Design a protein around this motif. Structure first.
Motif, PDB file in Angstrom:
ATOM      1  N   UNK A   1      33.779  42.346  40.090  1.00 45.60           N
ATOM      2  CA  UNK A   1      34.887  43.299  38.668  1.00 45.60           C
ATOM      3  C   UNK A   1      34.210  41.622  38.108  1.00 45.60           C
ATOM      4  N   UNK A   2      34.081  42.741  36.459  1.00 45.54           N
ATOM      5  CA  UNK A   2      34.241  42.134  35.273  1.00 45.54           C
ATOM      6  C   UNK A   2      34.593  41.879  34.319  1.00 45.54           C
ATOM      7  N   UNK A   3      35.634  41.524  33.657  1.00 43.64           N
ATOM      8  CA  UNK A   3      36.673  41.695  32.845  1.00 43.64           C
ATOM      9  C   UNK A   3      36.321  40.658  31.329  1.00 43.64           C
ATOM     10  N   UNK A   4      36.670  41.433  30.144  1.00 47.47           N
ATOM     11  CA  UNK A   4      36.503  40.956  28.939  1.00 47.47           C
ATOM     12  C   UNK A   4      36.573  42.048  28.475  1.00 47.47           C
TER      13      UNK A   4
ATOM     14  N   UNK B   1      36.101  36.213  34.575  1.00 47.16           N
ATOM     15  CA  UNK B   1      37.171  36.634  33.220  1.00 47.16           C
ATOM     16  C   UNK B   1      36.789  36.212  32.414  1.00 47.16           C
ATOM     17  N   UNK B   2      36.558  37.126  31.348  1.00 49.18           N
ATOM     18  CA  UNK B   2      36.977  36.261  30.058  1.00 49.18           C
ATOM     19  C   UNK B   2      38.002  35.844  30.186  1.00 49.18           C
ATOM     20  N   UNK B   3      38.386  35.162  29.219  1.00 53.03           N
ATOM     21  CA  UNK B   3      39.256  34.153  28.486  1.00 53.03           C
ATOM     22  C   UNK B   3      40.945  34.675  27.666  1.00 53.03           C
ATOM     23  N   UNK B   4      39.766  34.799  26.088  1.00 56.97           N
ATOM     24  CA  UNK B   4      39.813  34.822  25.553  1.00 56.97           C
ATOM     25  C   UNK B   4      40.401  36.538  25.002  1.00 56.97           C
ATOM     26  N   UNK B   5      41.660  37.332  25.331  1.00 58.99           N
ATOM     27  CA  UNK B   5      41.735  38.855  24.841  1.00 58.99           C
ATOM     28  C   UNK B   5      42.693  39.198  24.970  1.00 58.99           C
ATOM     29  N   UNK B   6      43.073  40.637  23.953  1.00 63.64           N
ATOM     30  CA  UNK B   6      44.547  40.106  23.111  1.00 63.64           C
ATOM     31  C   UNK B   6      45.660  40.288  24.143  1.00 63.64           C
TER      32      UNK B   6
ATOM     33  N   UNK C   1      44.400  34.926  35.646  1.00 63.78           N
ATOM     34  CA  UNK C   1      43.376  33.893  36.611  1.00 63.78           C
ATOM     35  C   UNK C   1      45.230  33.343  37.616  1.00 63.78           C
ATOM     36  N   UNK C   2      45.968  32.621  37.532  1.00 66.57           N
ATOM     37  CA  UNK C   2      47.391  32.029  37.941  1.00 66.57           C
ATOM     38  C   UNK C   2      47.694  32.899  38.734  1.00 66.57           C
ATOM     39  N   UNK C   3      48.456  34.400  37.773  1.00 64.03           N
ATOM     40  CA  UNK C   3      48.156  35.429  38.657  1.00 64.03           C
ATOM     41  C   UNK C   3      47.749  35.180  39.646  1.00 64.03           C
ATOM     42  N   UNK C   4      46.556  36.127  40.080  1.00 67.85           N
ATOM     43  CA  UNK C   4      45.525  35.969  40.898  1.00 67.85           C
ATOM     44  C   UNK C   4      45.731  35.050  42.233  1.00 67.85           C
ATOM     45  N   UNK C   5      45.753  34.249  42.220  1.00 70.93           N
ATOM     46  CA  UNK C   5      46.298  33.122  42.613  1.00 70.93           C
ATOM     47  C   UNK C   5      47.593  33.657  43.188  1.00 70.93           C
TER      48      UNK C   5
ATOM     49  N   UNK D   1      37.008  33.576  41.620  1.00 72.34           N
ATOM     50  CA  UNK D   1      37.403  33.828  39.908  1.00 72.34           C
ATOM     51  C   UNK D   1      36.178  32.610  39.447  1.00 72.34           C
ATOM     52  N   UNK D   2      35.855  33.203  38.319  1.00 77.62           N
ATOM     53  CA  UNK D   2      34.831  32.655  37.648  1.00 77.62           C
ATOM     54  C   UNK D   2      35.121  32.903  36.021  1.00 77.62           C
ATOM     55  N   UNK D   3      35.026  31.865  35.688  1.00 73.18           N
ATOM     56  CA  UNK D   3      36.025  32.221  33.602  1.00 73.18           C
ATOM     57  C   UNK D   3      34.177  32.001  32.775  1.00 73.18           C
ATOM     58  N   UNK D   4      34.515  33.075  32.212  1.00 71.33           N
ATOM     59  CA  UNK D   4      33.387  32.957  31.611  1.00 71.33           C
ATOM     60  C   UNK D   4      33.624  33.059  29.980  1.00 71.33           C
TER      61      UNK D   4
END
Ligand SMILES: Nc1nc2c(ncn2[C@@H]2O[C@@H]3COP(=O)(O)O[C@H]4[C@@H](O)[C@H](n5cnc6c(=O)[nH]c(N)nc65)O[C@@H]4COP(=O)(O)O[C@H]3[C@H]2O)c(=O)[nH]1
Ligand SMILES: Nc1nc2c(ncn2[C@@H]2O[C@@H]3COP(=O)(O)O[C@H]4[C@@H](O)[C@H](n5cnc6c(=O)[nH]c(N)nc65)O[C@@H]4COP(=O)(O)O[C@H]3[C@H]2O)c(=O)[nH]1
Ligand SMILES: Nc1nc2c(ncn2[C@@H]2O[C@@H]3COP(=O)(O)O[C@H]4[C@@H](O)[C@H](n5cnc6c(=O)[nH]c(N)nc65)O[C@@H]4COP(=O)(O)O[C@H]3[C@H]2O)c(=O)[nH]1
Ligand SMILES: Nc1nc2c(ncn2[C@@H]2O[C@@H]3COP(=O)(O)O[C@H]4[C@@H](O)[C@H](n5cnc6c(=O)[nH]c(N)nc65)O[C@@H]4COP(=O)(O)O[C@H]3[C@H]2O)c(=O)[nH]1
Ligand SMILES: Nc1nc2c(ncn2[C@@H]2O[C@@H]3COP(=O)(O)O[C@H]4[C@@H](O)[C@H](n5cnc6c(=O)[nH]c(N)nc65)O[C@@H]4COP(=O)(O)O[C@H]3[C@H]2O)c(=O)[nH]1
Ligand code: BEF
Ligand code: BEF
Ligand SMILES: [Mg+2]
Ligand SMILES: [Mg+2]
Ligand SMILES: [Mg+2]
Lengths: 441, 458
Positions: free
Chosen positions: A5-8, A51-56, A64-68, A78-81
């Protein structure tokens, strides 16, 4: 080979990554923000999340906190990119539970090595979660440190020392031994000078007893080919030299946490197995349960008190049966025999399935003479009237060989009592078979 | 990162292979003949065995037969590596149970891809073996996987080239139940049903064989399903890719029928082997005779035993006693602290009971908040004494609860009874204990009350 699952928030980014991934044959799904991403993860249970970090709105650290913090998604790596390269941001990432933190533009060779690594570990965890399905913290815990750089070994030990229990060992030969004890995590120096860090790690993986033990490798950051090799031989996670203390604390926690969850599954599965008291095929009590009872009975016997006897019964030629008529009829022979046994012995007696083709009966308050009489009774019983299963097979003729034993006052033990009956069985079979043979001190 | 056992009669061959393998970080052990090789395997349990075929004395085919006929070593994948290239020998190799058959001089890139493939499957099967072997050692699980075979078996053929699928299905027809499927979209559905093996055409023209196989691996429901790929032999890079996405085994075009049989047998036996382990670990967890929460025997089992014991008593013979225990105010607990803590009260109490009573006794979960202990060869006086003992234990120290963070006081009321002459019954015995319990609760609570049987004056 995996669902990713790719998020950005920038579509150009998602499309590119998707392409690279689908080109190596992963099933890729996508999301353009935080809320959507949470929803998809909850619903589809991806193997991995990128997972991207900066997003509106909701940013990646919250996502990522919520996922855990949700039990359903908690297990997903999770891998932050991210475009961020600052150390502060890297540490906030790993502290919030991410397996890795990659700064754009990413090294593809590395990403794939890493995805392959995570899917390889996820195999064992996922099958355990299935097995449990049919029916926790990262502080503390002992950390062995295998480095021949004294000074650097000491800072790692200093840093961990506050919340864990670190132990240094430079001699690799001894470190193989200590690894076998109660250790939660191994930190290795891949860039050691007096041994090959990777080779030593390979040795642990190769060895059965330590194969699941987490290993954390300290690696030269300017040497990509050696990092990839490390992930390939089975390292759980990589640390760059020089060693950031905060990063070190965060990755150790993470590993000790995931390790403990996997033991938690392995331990729940053993606990349930322990409660099970019967043998499934035959419906008698199992070996485990019988030995537990035999222990208390024999102890009470040795301290003065009721003698206990044991019968050990072995079905004759039970292979020829399985070979000639098949294992399905073999299962029936054992099932019938079990019922004959149970019904020809008092209810205070304890008949059980001891081994493949072996059964044991435990007779409280019974000395050797009565036990030999009981045994002879059972014998004639199986040899006296044919089995219902041998009816239409003019080939079967089921007989047993029995070994009898009794406690011998103080000093005696369950192991000696069953071993004495095994000598009885052995002797019964050498006589001819279909015979009862007793055995005293 | 894997233990590999190399076997060959020419030392030059062993040294070379050992070197290549240790250079990629495997723990390598070696053997110069058959007997030694069998011994080492039995003793050290290597992850993989690499095996010469031509050797003085026992040859590789016999070695390999023996490895498969022994339960200890049966699970170890064997790769034959041999100067022989004849088809006859290849087939004899696969039929004797080998995972692959490589002709010297071997392609290294392929060997490694293959070793990595085998170690990757062996992770799940190894974990299930480990749980199972633990179970057998602890004395619960029994069984004999020797009853497993690779015949029968539904084989799903996913090919675009109709003619080839038919020749494939033709050859499988006598020993198995094959089914063709050329629409890949539908083949994803069928794959989900009761299928034992998928045969895919990697060199398909209207879809990507490998892609389709990846899709199966990606999807959770089919990830363990064995897949067998038909591949163009003169295209190494695509074979390696196949092994890397998760193909269980590879068949070269054009399709040799006998090789086809042998390899399909092996893959089905393997799949069945795995299912057998899953089902041992599952079926053993079922719960016939015990109570799930407490682990004590259930009411059904107790009454069966209580019938035989009491009968034997009435015909002259050992008296039997029964304790009937009822936890006091057990609702107020469930009401105040919730049923989750109520379950912990019962669970703890169960362990205090079981450990304060002899093993020959029979403690069980009788009802919701009621327990019964059966005491063979015990008359009423001794049963009253046993009861009083148990009472003081539960009332004597408080109970842990709420994750070891709260302490709670728990009392029990007990009723005691004992067999009483040639006209007694289990029913009568338990009803006499029921009266005991009722009387104890009337007295206040936290009391033992025994009740003897009484005939009327006439
Ligand atoms: N022949 C003999 N054996 C002895 C004697 N004392 C202890 N044992 C043995 O040692 C085990 C532990 O005794 P415990 O610690 O008092 O723990 C005991 C005790 O708490 C209770 N229990 C059993 N019988 C009696 C009894 O007659 N009086 C009392 N007060 N408690 C008993 O049940 C527990 C377990 O009983 P077991 O399962 O039989 O297991 C008992 C028994 O096998 C003894 O005086 N003579
Ligand atoms: N735990 C246990 N002990 C066993 C068993 N079979 C025999 N014994 C012991 O061996 C003694 C003699 O048994 P017997 O020679 O058949 O001679 C026996 C037998 O002829 C008869 N008897 C007792 N119960 C039964 C029974 O359930 N069925 C039959 N058919 N006869 C019984 O009374 C005689 C004396 O009985 P006991 O005084 O009890 O003395 C019995 C008993 O202590 C058994 O399956 N389990
Ligand atoms: N971990 C593990 N070890 C295994 C397995 N199968 C066999 N073994 C080990 O190898 C011995 C011989 O197995 P066998 O050749 O099947 O010869 C066996 C088998 O033919 C038969 N047997 C054992 N269990 C069963 C069963 O559940 N059903 C039937 N029909 N036969 C059984 O009795 C013979 C002796 O059995 P054992 O005394 O148990 O001794 C067994 C056992 O320790 C297995 O699946 N897993
Ligand atoms: N030869 C012999 N066989 C023994 C002996 N003890 C047990 N058995 C065998 O094991 C069976 C079960 O005994 P049970 O479960 O206690 O259940 C027994 C028991 O409760 C009662 N019973 C039968 N005979 C006697 C007896 O002589 N004395 C007593 N007290 N009870 C008996 O009836 C039930 C069924 O009796 P069976 O039909 O005989 O079936 C008996 C018998 O075949 C024994 O001492 N000698
Ligand atoms: N089936 C069964 N019967 C029970 C149990 N508890 C007591 N009894 C019976 O009650 C009799 C006397 O018990 P006691 O007052 O504890 O007086 C007991 C006790 O003070 C001591 N004793 C024996 N075994 C143990 C034990 O395991 N633990 C302790 N703590 N004391 C024991 O020896 C005395 C004499 O014991 P016995 O001659 O065996 O005679 C025992 C026994 O027949 C029980 O849990 N299960
Ligand atoms: F927007 Be991402 F953090 F690069
Ligand atoms: F000697 Be081997 F079969 F090449
Ligand atoms: Mg962004
Ligand atoms: Mg056996
Ligand atoms: Mg040779």
């Amino acid at each position: 080979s995996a669902r990713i699952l790719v998020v950005d928030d920038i579509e150009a980014n998602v499309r590119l990554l998707e392409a690279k991934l689908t080109a190596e044959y992963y099933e890729v799904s996508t999301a353009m923000d935080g809320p959507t991403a949470l929803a998809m993860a909850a619903r589809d249970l991806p193997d991995i999340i990128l997972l991207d970090v900066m997003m509106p709105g909701m940013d990646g650290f919250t996502v990522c906190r919520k996922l855990k913090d949700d039990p359903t998604t908690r297990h997903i790596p999770v891998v932050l990119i991210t475009a961020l390269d600052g150390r502060g941001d890297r540490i906030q990432g790993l502290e919030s539970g991410a397996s890795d933190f990659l700064t754009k533009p990413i090294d593809d060779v590395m990403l794939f090595a890493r995805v392959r690594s995570l899917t390889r570990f996820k195999l064992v965890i996922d099958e355990l979660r299935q097995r449990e399905a049919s029916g926790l913290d990262g502080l503390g815990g002992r950390v062995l440190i295998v480095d021949d750089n004294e000074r650097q070994a000491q800072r790692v030990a200093a840093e961990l020392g506050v919340e864990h229990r670190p132990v240094i060992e430079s001699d690799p030969e001894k470190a193989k031994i200590s690894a076998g004890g109660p250790v939660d995590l191994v930190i290795v120096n891949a860039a050691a000078k007096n041994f090959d860090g990777l080779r030593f790690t390979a040795a642990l993986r190769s060895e059965e007893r330590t194969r699941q033990l987490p290993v954390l490798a300290m690696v030269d950051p300017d040497d990509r080919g050696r990092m990839v090799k490390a992930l390939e031989i089975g390292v759980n996670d990589i640390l760059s030299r020089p060693i950031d203390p905060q990063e070190l604390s965060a990755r150790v926690k993470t590993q000790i946490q995931r390790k403990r969850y996997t033991d938690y599954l392995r331990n729940n599965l053993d606990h349930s197995l322990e409660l099970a008291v019967t043998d499934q095929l035959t419906g008698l009590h199992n070996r485990r349960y019988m030995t537990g009872q035999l222990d208390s009975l024999v102890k009470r016997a040795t301290l003065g008190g009721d003698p206990v006897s044991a019968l050990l019964i072995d079905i004759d030629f039970f292979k020829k049966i399985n070979d000639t008529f098949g294992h399905d009829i073999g299962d029936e022979v054992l099932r019938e025999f079990a019922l004959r046994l149970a019904s020809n012995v008092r209810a205070i007696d304890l008949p059980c399935r001891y081994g493949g083709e072996e059964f044991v009966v435990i007779m409280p308050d019974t000395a050797l003479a009565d036990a030999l009489r009981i045994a002879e009774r059972i014998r004639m019983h199986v040899s006296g009237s044919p089995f219902t299963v041998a009816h239409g097979r003019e080939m079967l003729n089921v007989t047993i060989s029995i070994g009898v034993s009794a406690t011998a006052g103080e000093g005696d033990t369950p192991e000696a009592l069953l071993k004495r009956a095994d000598e009885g069985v052995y002797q019964a079979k050498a006589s001819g078979r279909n015979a009862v043979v007793g055995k005293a001190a």
